[PDB]
Design a protein around this ligand. Structure first.
Ligand code: ULK
Length: 113
C-alpha cells in the first residue's frame, strides 16, 4: 500500500506495455537475453559487462528483486545503454532501442509521487 509498492506498480504497468503487441515491431530485440553466439557477436560479452533484457526485468519484478522504481529504471536503461554501446548507430536495433526508450521515458516520467 506504501509509496514504494505503488511506484513499483507503475513500473510493472510500463513493463507490461513494453512487452505488449502495441510496441512489438521495435520491442522484440529486447524480449530475451542477446544470444551473442547465435548472432555471431563473439565480442559482445567482452564489450557488455552487464547484459540486460525485458525477460530478466520481468523475472526480477516477479521475484520482488526491485526495492524501488529507481532500481527497475536502472535495469531498463542498462538494457538500452548496452544496445547504444555495442551497435553502430545506423543498425536497425539502435533505431528500435531509441523508439522503445521514448515509450519508457515518457511513461516513467508520469510516476505517481
Ligand atoms: C539487443 N540486441 C542487439 O544488440 C542486437 C545486435 C545485433 C547485431 O548484429 N549487431 C551488430 C552490428 C553490431 C556489430 C543484432 C540483433 C538482432 O536481434 C536484430 C536483428 C535485426 C534487427 C534488430 C535486431 N540484436
Amino acid at each position: 500500500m506504501g509509496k514504494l509498492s505503488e511506484q513499483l506498480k507503475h513500473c510493472n504497468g510500463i513493463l507490461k506495455e513494453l512487452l505488449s503487441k502495441k510496441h512489438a515491431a521495435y520491442a522484440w530485440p529486447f524480449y530475451k537475453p542477446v544470444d551473442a553466439s547465435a548472432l555471431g557477436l563473439h565480442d559482445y560479452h567482452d564489450i557488455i559487462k552487464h547484459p540486460m533484457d525485458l525477460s530478466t526485468v520481468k523475472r526480477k519484478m516477479e521475484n520482488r528483486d526491485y526495492r524501488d522504481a529507481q532500481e527497475f529504471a536502472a535495469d531498463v536503461r542498462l538494457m538500452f545503454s548496452n544496445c547504444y554501446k555495442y551497435n553502430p548507430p545506423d543498425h536497425d536495433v539502435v533505431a528500435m532501442a531509441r523508439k522503445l526508450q521514448d515509450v519508457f521515458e515518457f511513461r516513467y516520467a508520469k510516476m505517481p509521487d
